[PDB]
Design a protein around this ligand. Structure first.
Ligand SMILES: CCCCCCCCCCCCCCCCCC(=O)OC[C@H](COP(=O)([O-])OCC[N+](C)(C)C)OC(=O)CCCCCCCCCCCCCCCCC
Ligand SMILES: CCCCCCCCCCCCCCCCCC(=O)OC[C@H](COP(=O)([O-])OCC[N+](C)(C)C)OC(=O)CCCCCCCCCCCCCCCCC
Ligand SMILES: CCCCCCCCCCCCCCCCCC(=O)OC[C@H](COP(=O)([O-])OCC[N+](C)(C)C)OC(=O)CCCCCCCCCCCCCCCCC
Ligand SMILES: CCCCCCCCCCCCCCCCCC(=O)OC[C@H](COP(=O)(O)OCCN)OC(=O)CCCCCCCCCCCCCCCCC
Ligand SMILES: CCCCCCCCCCCCCCCCCC(=O)OC[C@H](COP(=O)(O)OCCN)OC(=O)CCCCCCCCCCCCCCCCC
Ligand SMILES: CCCCCCCCCCCCCCCCCC(=O)OC[C@H](COP(=O)(O)OCCN)OC(=O)CCCCCCCCCCCCCCCCC
Ligand SMILES: CCCCCCCCCCCCCCCCCC(=O)OC[C@H](COP(=O)(O)OCCN)OC(=O)CCCCCCCCCCCCCCCCC
Ligand SMILES: CCCCCCCCCCC1=C(C)C(=O)C(OC)=C(OC)C1=O
Ligand code: SF4
Ligand code: SF4
Ligand code: SF4
Lengths: 318, 104, 70, 360, 97, 176, 156, 80
C-alpha cells in the first residue's frame, strides 16, 4: 500500500516532466508571437511522447569516456536526487513526514552538484571539465543564499518541519512578511537549476558549448528530465514556502488544487523569465550573488532573527 | 523504514531509466564508426573555498529557529547577530582585499 | 490562440494533482478513515504506541473510547 | 577569463566572387552583389549601380532614384533588425528576434512584390531599376511604416533599459575615435565613437540630399551606443520612408538611353532599333568607357565600396569590393583586449559582421 | 460576458464541420478547426475556403483531398497537390478564384 | 542634423535618486519586460497553417522554369540563345537545328536548376516569352540529377503550369 | 503473418517518433541562413512541426546545409557530419549547396555538398523561400514515414 | 553627512539597504516594548513537568491546586 503511494508520487513526476517540455515550447511559442507544437498531437499533446521515443532510440553519440563508473553514476545520482526531493513536500501531506524536511531538501540539493562534477570528469575534454567547474561554482554560490533565506524564513515557522509551514501561513501568505527574501529566493532557485538568465552551460559565456567540440556526454534525456523534475520541485517548494494555501483537514483536495495552480503559475513564471531576458555573463552572476544578494540576505537574516524577539512573535517549536 | 523503501525505489527507478537509456539504443545495429593539464585559475579555487568557509558559518547559523526558544534571549540574540556579523565581516574582507574580482 | 496552451497545462496540472490526492486517500485508507498520525516527538510516538497496545488488534488507529472501561 | 589574443580565421565563405565578376558582363555581375551582404541586398545593388553609372556618364531618372532611396531604407530596416536581433540572440535574448522577423517577413514581401524574389532581387540596376512599382505597393509600404514605430518601441522596451542587456554592452568594445579612423572603420563603428560622419550626408547620392533625417551619434564608443545608434537609424529610416512615399515623382524607371538600359518589351517587339538594342544588351551588354572608379555608399553596415575598373569592353576588368565587415573584423582583435570570452560575442554583434562581404 | 460568445463560437465551429466526426477529421488532418466560406472544389476534391475576418495569410485555405491520382492522401497531404488554377488564388496572386 | 543617443546626465535630487534606487531594488524595468512578453502571450500568433495555408506571393515571383507555347501548341522558343548568353550562372545549355519542316527550334534546352540563381534574366531576355520562371517553388527533389532539367521536363512544366503562367504574365506584362 | 504485422506497426511507431521530432543542425553558411531563420520566424514556424530551432549539433537529426560550401569549410562540414548520431539526414538548401550554384566555376567552392556528405533532400532556390524549405522538411518527414527498417530487418 | 548619504544611495543602494536593515536589526530590540514579552512567553512554555513541592507548612505563595488563586498567572498572555 505504501509502494502504491511511492509510485503515485514518482510516476506522475515523470509525466509532469514530460508535459513541461510541451508547456515550455508552447508558452515560449506564444510569447515569441508564434505557436508551439500543434501538429504531432491534437494541440501538440503527442510531442513529449514522440520526442521521448526519438531520444531513446538515438545512437550514443560518437566518443568514449574517461571514467565509465562516473559516466554511469552521474545520471543515476541526478535522477535519484531529483526524485527524492519530492518525498517531504507537504501537498497537504508529505509522503515521508519528517521533522527536518527543509534541511533534508537543502542537503539533497547540495548533493546535486556531484552529477555536474562527475559528468565533467567523465567527459574526455579538458574544456568540458572547465565548463562543469564553472557550473559547480555557480550552483554552490547560490546554495549559500538558498540556505540563509531558508533559515530566515524558518525563523517565522519555528521548525524545519515542512508541514508546519502550512500552519504558519494560515492567516497570511508568507510573502507578505518576507517578500525581499521571496524575490531573492525565487531568483536564487532560478540560478540553482541552471535556468535562464543563468544558463551558462546551455548557452554562450562558455568555453565548450561552441559547435564541433569533443566531450562524450551522457544520454541527454536523463539529465534533462532530472533538471525539469528539479524545476517543478523548486517551484512547488517556493509555493509551500511563501504562498502557502488554505488547508481544510477534511478536504485535502482543496489544498492540492490550490498549491497545484500556484506551482503551475510559478513554473510558467520560470518559462516567462527565460523568454524575456538576455543571459548574464559569468562574473555578472557571481557579482549578483556575492556583492548584491548576500549582503541583503545577511541583513535580512539579522532582521528576521531580531524581529520576532522585538515583536514578541517567536513561533512555537512544535 | 518507509524512507529506506522510498530511497531504494527512487534509486531503482533511476537505475532502470539509465540502463534502458544505455541499452535500448543498442538494439538497432548501427554502422560501426571508423573515422577519427587543464589551465589553472586561482579565482575558481577561491570561489569554492569562500563557499566552504561561508557554508561552515551557515552550519553555525542553522540551529537558530531552535535557539530562539531559549530563556536566555539576550545572550542568544547577541550571539546570533554576532555570527551573522562575522559572516558579513568575512564577506567585507573578501570584498576589500580584491578577493571577489573577475568572478565578482 | 493563447488557450491552445491550456491542454498541456491541464495535463501537467492533473499530473501534479495525482500525488497529493493519492497520498491523502492512501493515508485515510491505511488509518481508519482518518489522518495519518504525526509523531515528530517521542511523546507523540509514546501515545501512538500506547494506542497500538490498548486497541487489542496491534493497530494504533483502532480507537477505544468509554465503551472500553466499565 | 581574459582574452589576450583574438585571431579570426576567415575565408570559410570565400567564393572568389570578384574573379567570377571578371568573366561576366556588368548586368551578369550585378547579382553577385545581392549575395555579398545578404541582409543588405538592394543597398549593394545601389552601390554597384552607382559605380557603373559613374563610369558610363549617365544618370538614373528621378523616380528610379526615389525608388532606390525608399528600398535602401527598407533594406536598412532589414539589416538593423538582423543586427540587433542576432546580437540579442547570441547574448541570450531570444524573443525580439521572433518579434521583429515578422516585420522583416513583410519587408521581404515588399521585395517579392517589386521583383519576384524575396531576397536577391537584382532590381536596382545600372540605369535605374529593373521594373516599376506594382499598383498598391506604396499603400502597403505606408501600412507597414505606420505601425513599425511600435515594433521598434517594444524591442526597445525589451532591451534598452534592461539592466542585464546593459551589463552586457555598456563597458564592452570601447573604440576611440582616432583608432576608429585609423582601423578603417565606417558607419556605426565610427558614429558610436562620436565621429559625425555619414555618407548620406557628407557625400550624398541619389536623392539623399532631398530627404530629411537625423544622424545618431554615440558618446562612449561601446556596444551599447552602437546598439542605440542602430535603433535610432531604424527610427530615421522610418522617417525617410515616410518622406519617400510622400515625394515619389512620376516618370520612367530606367535611363532612357537604350544603349545602356533595355527597351520595353512592347517596343522591343515593334521597333527594329529596340530589338537590336535588346539583343546586344542581353548578349554582349553595354560597353563601359575605360576607367577606374571608387564609388562608395552608406550601407547599413558602413561604407560599402566598389573599386571597379573598366577596359572599354562589356565586362569588368577588376572589381574590388570594399566591405565594412572586413575592416571591422580586422579590428576585432583590438576591440576585445582585456575583455572576457562572453564579451567577444557581443563585440562580434556590435561589429555587424556578415561573412559574405568579409570573404567575397 | 464575452466568454460565452467565445464558447458559442467554439461550439458552432464544432457544428460547422458536421458534428464531432467532421470536427475531429479536420482537427487531425488540418490541425485547424475553424470554419470558412467554401469558394470552390477542384476536380480532385481539394476544397478552398475563405474567411476575410482572419488576418492576411490565414484568410484563404485548402483542405486537401484524401485521394489524388491514386495515392492515399488522408495523412500524406502535400503542398504540390494544388492544381495551377487554384494556385494563384491560394497563394494570393489574385483576388479571383 | 544629428542627435546624441546616450548623452543624458541623470538628475541628482533625492526624488530621482530614490526613483533609480527603487528601479534597482524593486526590478521595475524587469517587470516592464515581463509585461511586454506577457502582452505578446495574449496576441493571435502570426503562424499560417502550412501546407493548408500558403504564404502570399505576387505575379512577379520567380520559381520553377518552364518553356511556353503559342495558343496553337507551337513552342515559342526559336533557339536564339539569348537566355544562355545572359544566364549569369551559365545554367542554360542550348543546341539547335532546323527541324523537319524547316523551323528554327531547339534540340537541347537544358537548365541546371542547381546552378540556377533564379534571377529571371532569361525570362526578361527572351524576345518571344518562351522561357519564363513560373510560380512553382514546391519542387524539392530527393536526388541531385532530378534538378538537371532537359527540354522535356521544361515543356512538361510549361504544359503543367500554363493556366497560371499565362495569367501571371497577363497581370505583369505592362510593367515589362 | 503475425511477426510481419508486429514489425510493421513498430516501424510505424519509430518512424512517427523520428519524423515528428526532427532536431535540425543548420550550417548557416551564407544567404540561405537568413531564409532558414525566416522558416523559424513566427509565420512559418518550424517549431510547431516538432522541428526545434537552434537545436544542439551534438543531438541533431537532420543537418540542413544552408549556404555555399567552400573548399576551406568542407572538412569542417564532414567533421560535423561524422559527429552526428544516426539516424542522420541531410537537407541541401539552395543552389550553392546543391550544385555549386552561382559559384559553380569557382576555384574555392565545392560543387554541391553531395561531394562531401550524402544528401537526402535537395531544396532548389537562390535562396529557396522559407516556405520552400518547409516544403523540403515535410518531404523529408514523408521520406522517413515510408522507411522499412524493421520490415527489412525481418525479411533478412 | 547628507551629501555622502545621497551619494551612496545613488551609487550603491543595495549596500545602503543592507546597512540600514542591519542597523535596525541591531538597535531595534533594545528600543521595542515587546522584547520583554518574548522572554516572558519563552519562560512560560511548559516543556518539563511541574514537579510539586512537599508541603512543609510555610509556603503561602504556592497553590495546592492548579485552579487556586496564588501562583504564576498567564492572564497577560491571554489578553496582551
Ligand atoms: C515567490 C514568487 C516570485 C517572487 C518575485 C519575483 C518575480 C519577479 C522576477 C522578475 C525577473 C527577474 C529576472 C532575474 C533578474 C536578475 C537581476 C536583478 O534583479 O538583480 C538584482 C539587483 C542587482 O543590482 P543591479 O545590478 O541592478 O544594480 C547595480 C548594482 N551595483 C551598484 C552593485 C553595481 O538588485 C538587487 O540585488 C535587489 C535584490 C532584492 C532587493 C530587496 C529590497 C528590500 C528593500 C527593503 C527596504 C529598502 C529601503 C531602505 C531601507 C529602509 C529601512 C526601513
Ligand atoms: C518506455 C519509454 C519509451 C521507450 C522507446 C519506445 C518503445 C519502443 C522500443 C523499441 C523500438 C523498436 C526497436 C528498436 C529500434 C529499431 C530500429 C532499427 O533501425 O532497427 C534495425 C535493427 C537492425 O536491422 P538490420 O539488420 O537491417 O541492420 C541495419 C544496419 N546494418 C545493415 C548496417 C547492419 O533491427 C534490430 O536490431 C531489431 C530489434 C528488435 C525489433 C523489435 C523487437 C521488439 C522490441 C520491443
Ligand atoms: C567579543 C565578545 C562578544 C560577547 C559579548 C557578551 C555576550 C554575552 O551576552 O555574554 C554573556 C554570556 C553568558 O552569560 P549569561 O548571563 O547568559 O549567563 C547565565 C548562565 N547560563 C549561560 C547558564 C544561562 O557569556 C559569559 O558570561 C561568558 C562567556 C563570554 C565571556 C567573554 C568573552 C570575551 C572574548 C574576547 C576575545
Ligand atoms: C495523467 C494524464 C496523462 C495523459 C497522457 C496522454 C495525453 C494525450 C492524450 C491523447 C490525445 C489524443 C491522441 C490522438 C492520437 C491519434 C489517434 C489516431 O487516430 O491516430 C491515427 C493513426 C492512424 O489511423 P488510421 O487507421 O491510419 O486512420 C485512417 C482513417 N481513415 O492511428 C494510430 O496511430 C493508432 C491509434 C493510436 C492512438 C494513440 C492515442 C494516444 C496514446 C498516448 C499514450 C498514453 C495513453 C494514456 C495513458 C494514461 C491514462 C490512462
Ligand atoms: C553514487 C552512489 C549512489 C548515488 C544515488 C543514491 C544515493 C544518494 C541519494 C540518497 C540519499 C539518502 C538520504 C537519506 C537520509 C536523509 C536524512 C533523514 O533520514 O531524514 C529523515 C528523517 C529525519 O526527520 P525526523 O522526523 O527527525 O526523524 C524521524 C523521527 N521521527 O529521518 C528518518 O526518517 C530516519 C530514517 C532511518 C535512517 C535512514 C538511513 C538511510 C540509509 C543510510 C544512508 C543511505 C545513503 C548512503 C549513500 C549516500 C550518497 C553517497
Ligand atoms: C500486436 C499489436 C501491437 C504491435 C506493436 C505496436 C505497439 C503500439 C505502438 C503505437 C501504435 C503503432 C502505430 C503508430 C502510428 C502509426 C500511424 C501514423 O503514423 O499515423 C499518422 C498520424 C498523423 O499523420 P501524419 O502522417 O503525421 O500527417 C501530418 C499531419 N497532417 O499519426 C497520428 O495521428 C498520431 C500517431 C500517434 C502514435 C501512437 C501514440 C504514441 C505511442 C504511445 C505508446 C508508446 C509510448 C508510451 C510512452 C513512452 C514514454 C512517454
Ligand atoms: C551597525 C549595524 C551592523 C553593521 C554590520 C552588518 C552589515 C550587514 C551587511 C553586510 C555587507 C557585507 C559587505 C560589506 C562590504 C562593505 C565594503 C564595500 O562594499 O565597499 C565598496 C563600496 C563601493 O563598491 P565597489 O567596490 O565599487 O563595488 C564594485 C561596483 N562599483 O563602497 C561603498 O559603497 C561604501 C560602503 C560604506 C558606506 C555605506 C553606508 C550605508 C549607510 C546606511 C545607513 C546607516 C546604517 C547603519 C550602519 C552604519 C553605516 C555607516
Ligand atoms: C522523458 C521525456 C523526454 C522529452 C524530451 C524533450 C526535450 C526538449 C525538446 C525541445 C528542447 C528544448 C525546449 C530546449 O530547451 C533545448 O535546450 C536548448 C533543447 O535541446 C537542444 C531541446 O531540444
Ligand atoms: S533565372 Fe537566371 S540563373 Fe536561372 S536559368 Fe534564368 S538567367 Fe539563368
Ligand atoms: S531567349 Fe527564349 S527564344 Fe531565345 S533561345 Fe532562350 S528560350 Fe529560346
Ligand atoms: S544558393 Fe544562393 S541565395 Fe542561397 S546561400 Fe547560396 S548564394 Fe546565397
Amino acid at each position: 500500500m505504501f509502494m502504491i503511494n511511492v509510485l503515485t508520487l514518482i510516476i506522475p513526476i515523470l509525466l509532469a516532466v514530460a508535459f513541461l517540455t510541451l508547456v515550455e515550447r508552447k508558452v515560449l511559442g506564444y510569447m515569441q508571437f508564434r505557436k508551439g507544437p500543434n501538429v504531432v498531437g491534437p494541440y501538440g499533446l503527442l510531442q513529449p511522447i514522440a520526442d521521448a521515443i526519438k531520444l531513446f532510440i538515438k545512437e550514443p553519440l560518437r566518443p568514449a569516456t574517461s571514467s565509465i563508473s562516473m559516466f554511469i553514476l552521474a545520471p543515476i545520482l541526478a535522477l535519484t536526487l531529483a526524485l527524492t526531493m519530492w518525498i517531504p513536500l507537504p501537498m497537504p501531506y508529505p509522503l515521508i513526514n519528517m521533522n527536518l524536511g527543509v534541511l533534508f531538501m537543502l542537503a539533497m540539493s547540495s548533493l546535486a552538484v556531484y552529477s555536474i562534477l562527475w559528468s565533467g570528469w567523465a567527459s574526455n575534454s579538458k574544456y568540458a571539465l572547465i565548463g562543469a567547474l564553472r557550473a559547480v561554482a555557480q550552483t554552490i554560490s547560490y546554495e549559500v543564499t538558498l540556505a540563509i533565506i531558508l533559515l530566515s524564513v524558518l525563523l517565522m515557522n519555528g521548525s524545519f518541519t515542512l508541514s508546519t509551514l502550512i500552519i504558519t501561513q494560515e492567516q497570511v501568505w508568507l510573502i507578505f512578511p518576507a517578500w525581499p527574501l521571496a524575490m531573492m529566493w525565487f531568483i536564487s532557485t532560478l540560478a540553482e537549476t541552471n535556468r535562464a538568465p543563468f544558463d551558462l552551460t546551455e548557452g554562450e559565456s562558455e568555453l565548450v558549448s561552441g559547435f564541433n567540440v569533443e566531450y562524450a556526454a551522457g544520454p541527454f534525456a536523463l539529465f534533462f528530465m532530472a533538471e525539469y523534475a528539479n524545476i517543478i520541485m523548486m517551484n512547488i517548494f517556493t509555493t509551500t514556502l511563501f504562498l502557502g494555501a488554505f488547508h481544510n483537514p477534511y478536504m485535502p483536495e482543496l489544498y492540492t488544487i490550490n498549491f497545484t495552480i500556484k506551482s503551475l503559475l510559478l513554473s510558467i513564471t520560470f518559462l516567462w523569465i527565460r523568454a524575456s531576458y538576455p543571459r548574464f555573463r559569468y562574473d555578472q552572476l557571481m557579482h549578483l550573488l556575492w556583492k548584491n544578494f548576500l549582503p541583503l540576505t545577511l541583513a535580512l537574516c539579522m532582521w528576521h532573527v531580531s524581529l520576532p524577539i522585538l515583536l514578541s512573535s517567536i513561533p512555537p517549536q512544535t | 523504514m518507509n524512507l529506506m523503501i522510498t530511497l531504494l525505489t527512487n534509486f531503482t527507478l533511476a537505475t532502470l531509466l539509465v540502463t534502458i537509456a544505455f541499452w535500448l539504443p543498442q538494439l538497432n545495429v548501427y554502422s560501426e564508426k571508423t573515422s577519427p593539464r587543464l589551465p589553472f585559475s586561482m579565482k575558481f579555487f577561491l570561489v569554492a573555498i569562500t563557499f566552504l568557509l561561508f557554508d561552515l558559518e551557515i552550519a553555525l547559523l542553522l540551529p537558530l529557529p531552535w535557539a530562539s526558544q531559549t530563556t536566555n534571549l539576550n545572550t542568544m540574540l547577541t550571539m546570533a547577530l554576532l555570527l551573522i556579523f562575522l559572516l558579513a565581516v568575512s564577506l567585507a574582507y573578501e570584498w576589500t582585499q580584491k578577493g571577489l574580482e573577475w568572478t565578482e | 490562440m493563447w488557450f491552445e496552451v491550456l491542454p498541456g497545462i491541464a495535463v501537467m496540472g492533473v499530473c501534479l494533482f495525482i500525488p497529493g490526492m493519492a497520498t491523502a486517500r492512501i493515508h485515510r485508507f491505511s488509518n481508519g478513515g482518518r489522518e495519518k498520525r504525526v509523531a515528530h516527538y517521542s511523546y507523540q510516538w509514546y501515545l501512538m504506541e500506547r494506542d497500538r497496545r490498548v486497541s487489542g488488534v496491534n493497530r494504533y488507529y483502532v480507537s477505544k473510547g468509554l465503551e472500553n472501561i466499565d | 577569463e581574459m582574452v589576450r589574443k583574438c585571431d579570426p580565421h576567415i575565408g570559410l565563405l570565400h567564393r572568389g566572387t570578384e574573379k567570377l565578376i571578371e568573366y561576366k558582363t556588368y548586368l551578369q555581375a550585378l547579382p553577385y552583389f545581392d549575395r555579398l551582404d545578404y541582409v543588405s541586398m538592394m543597398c549593394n545593388e545601389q552601390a554597384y549601380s552607382l559605380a557603373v553609372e559613374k563610369l558610363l556618364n549617365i544618370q538614373p531618372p528621378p523616380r528610379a532614384q526615389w525608388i532606390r532611396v525608399l528600398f535602401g531604407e527598407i533594406t536598412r530596416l532589414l539589416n538593423h533588425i538582423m543586427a540587433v536581433t542576432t546580437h540579442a540572440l547570441d547574448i541570450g535574448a531570444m524573443t525580439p528576434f521572433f518579434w521583429m522577423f515578422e516585420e522583416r517577413e513583410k519587408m521581404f514581401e515588399f521585395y517579392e512584390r517589386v521583383s519576384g524574389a524575396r531576397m536577391h532581387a537584382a532590381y536596382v540596376r545600372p540605369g535605374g531599376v529593373h521594373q516599376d512599382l506594382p499598383l498598391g505597393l506604396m499603400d502597403d509600404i505606408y501600412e507597414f511604416s505606420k505601425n513599425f514605430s511600435l515594433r521598434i518601441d517594444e524591442l526597445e522596451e525589451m532591451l534598452t533599459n534592461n539592466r542585464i542587456w546593459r551589463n552586457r554592452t555598456v563597458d564592452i568594445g570601447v573604440v576611440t575615435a582616432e583608432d576608429a579612423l585609423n582601423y578603417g572603420f565606417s558607419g556605426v563603428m565610427l558614429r558610436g565613437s562620436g565621429i559625425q560622419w555619414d555618407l548620406r550626408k557628407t557625400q550624398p547620392y541619389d536623392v539623399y540630399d532631398q530627404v530629411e533625417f537625423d544622424v545618431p551619434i554615440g558618446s562612449r564608443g561601446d556596444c551599447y551606443d552602437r546598439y542605440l545608434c542602430r535603433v535610432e537609424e531604424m527610427r530615421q529610416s522610418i522617417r525617410i520612408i515616410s518622406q519617400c512615399l510622400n515625394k515619389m515623382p512620376p516618370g520612367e524607371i530606367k535611363v532612357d538611353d537604350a544603349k545602356v538600359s533595355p527597351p520595353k518589351r512592347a517596343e522591343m517587339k515593334t521597333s527594329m532599333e529596340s530589338l537590336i538594342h535588346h539583343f546586344k544588351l542581353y548578349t554582349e551588354g553595354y560597353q563601359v568607357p575605360p576607367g577606374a572608379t571608387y564609388t562608395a555608399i552608406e550601407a547599413p553596415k558602413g561604407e560599402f565600396g566598389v573599386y571597379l575598373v573598366s577596359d572599354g569592353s562589356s565586362r569588368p576588368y577588376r572589381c574590388k569590393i570594399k566591405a565594412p565587415g572586413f575592416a571591422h573584423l580586422a579590428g576585432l582583435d583590438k576591440m576585445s583586449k582585456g575583455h572576457m570570452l562572453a564579451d567577444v560575442v557581443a563585440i562580434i554583434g556590435t561589429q555587424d559582421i556578415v561573412f559574405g562581404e568579409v570573404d567575397r | 460576458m464575452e466568454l460565452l460568445q467565445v464558447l458559442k463560437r467554439g461550439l458552432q465551429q464544432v457544428s460547422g464541420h458536421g458534428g464531432l466526426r467532421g470536427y475531429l477529421r479536420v482537427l487531425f488532418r488540418a490541425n485547424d478547426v475553424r470554419v470558412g466560406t467554401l469558394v470552390g472544389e477542384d476536380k480532385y476534391g481539394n476544397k478552398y475556403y475563405e474567411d476575410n475576418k482572419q488576418f492576411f495569410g490565414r484568410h484563404r485555405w485548402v483542405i486537401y483531398t484524401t485521394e489524388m491520382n491514386g495515392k492515399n492522401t488522408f495523412w500524406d497531404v502535400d503542398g504540390s497537390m494544388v492544381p495551377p488554377e487554384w494556385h494563384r488564388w491560394l497563394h494570393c496572386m489574385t483576388d479571383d478564384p | 542634423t544629428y542627435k546624441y543617443v546616450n548623452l543624458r546626465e541623470p538628475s541628482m535630487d533625492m526624488k530621482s535618486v530614490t526613483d533609480r534606487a527603487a528601479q534597482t531594488l524593486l526590478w521595475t524595468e524587469l517587470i516592464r519586460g515581463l509585461g511586454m512578453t506577457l502582452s505578446y502571450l495574449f496576441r493571435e500568433p502570426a503562424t499560417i497553417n502550412y501546407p493548408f495555408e500558403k504564404g502570399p506571393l505576387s505575379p512577379r515571383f520567380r520559381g520553377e522554369h518552364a518553356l511556353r507555347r503559342y495558343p496553337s501548341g507551337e513552342e515559342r522558343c526559336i533557339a536564339c540563345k539569348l537566355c544562355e548568353a545572359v544566364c549569369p550562372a551559365q545554367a542554360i545549355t542550348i543546341e539547335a537545328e532546323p527541324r523537319a519542316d524547316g523551323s528554327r527550334r531547339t534540340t537541347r534546352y537544358d537548365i541546371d536548376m542547381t546552378k540556377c540563381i533564379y534571377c529571371g534574366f532569361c525570362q526578361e531576355a527572351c524576345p518571344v516569352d518562351a522561357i519564363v520562371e513560373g510560380p512553382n517553388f514546391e519542387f524539392s527533389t530527393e536526388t541531385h540529377e532530378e534538378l538537371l532539367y532537359n527540354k522535356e521536363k521544361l515543356l512538361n512544366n510549361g504544359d503543367k503550369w500554363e493556366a497560371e503562367i499565362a495569367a501571371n504574365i497577363q497581370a505583369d506584362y505592362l510593367y515589362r | 503473418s503475425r511477426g510481419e504485422y508486429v514489425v510493421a506497426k513498430l516501424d510505424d511507431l519509430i518512424n512517427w517518433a523520428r519524423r515528428s521530432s526532427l532536431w535540425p543542425m543548420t550550417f548557416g553558411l551564407a544567404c540561405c541562413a537568413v531564409e532558414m531563420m525566416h522558416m523559424a520566424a513566427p509565420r512559418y514556424d518550424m517549431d510547431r512541426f516538432g522541428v526545434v530551432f537552434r537545436a544542439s549539433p551534438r543531438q541533431s537529426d537532420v543537418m540542413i546545409v544552408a549556404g555555399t560550401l567552400t573548399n576551406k569549410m568542407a572538412p569542417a562540414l564532414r567533421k560535423v557530419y561524422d559527429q552526428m548520431p544516426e539516424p542522420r539526414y541531410v537537407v541541401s538548401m539552395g543552389s550553392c549547396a546543391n550544385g555549386g550554384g552561382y559559384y559553380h566555376y569557382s576555384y574555392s567552392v565545392v560543387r554541391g555538398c553531395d561531394r562531401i556528405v550524402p544528401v537526402d533532400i535537395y531544396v532548389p532556390g537562390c535562396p529557396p523561400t522559407a516556405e520552400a524549405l518547409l516544403y523540403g522538411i515535410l518531404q523529408l518527414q514523408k521520406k522517413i514515414k515510408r522507411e522499412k527498417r524493421l520490415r527489412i530487418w525481418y525479411r533478412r | 553627512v547628507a551629501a555622502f548619504l545621497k551619494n551612496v544611495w545613488a551609487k550603491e543602494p543595495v549596500l545602503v539597504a543592507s546597512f540600514a536593515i542591519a542597523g535596525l536589526a541591531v538597535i531595534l530590540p533594545t528600543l521595542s516594548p515587546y522584547t520583554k514579552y518574548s522572554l516572558m512567553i519563552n519562560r512560560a512554555t511548559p516543556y518539563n513537568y511541574p514537579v510539586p513541592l512537599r508541603d512543609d507548612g510555610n509556603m503561602p505563595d504556592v497553590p495546592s491546586h492548579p485552579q487556586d488563586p496564588q501562583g504564576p498567572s498567564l492572564e497577560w498572555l491571554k489578553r496582551l
